[PDB]
């Protein structure tokens, strides 16, 4: 246990989380928005941030606030 550690509407924050060969990749983008309802019909790509050799079998997730 405890085998790894790392440290470092008006806005939309976007992510992608994916696991390949035990490496876990996070992409991101932040933007202003003007549409009140939900995800705006437009286009803007996400850059990579993080790429971790965690080696775990991820099958579920949850969100914190």
């Amino acid at each position: 246990n405890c085998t790894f550690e790392y440290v470092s509407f008006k806005n939309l924050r976007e992510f992608v989380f994916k696991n390949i060969d035990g490496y876990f990749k996070i992409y991101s983008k932040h933007t202003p928005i003007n549409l009140v309802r939900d995800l705006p019909q437009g286009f803007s790509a996400l850059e990579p941030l993080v790429d971790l050799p965690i080696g775990i079998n991820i099958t579920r997730f949850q969100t914190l606030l």
Binding site: D21, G22, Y23, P53, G55, I56, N57
Partner: peptide
């Protein structure tokens, strides 16, 4: 020595049920 033991690419799991050397 008995400390060494065994059972996707670069996957890991230490949960256990396990074999070992001598």
């Amino acid at each position: 020595n008995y400390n060494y033991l065994y059972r996707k690419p670069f996957e890991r799991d230490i949960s256990t049920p396990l074999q070992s050397y001598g």
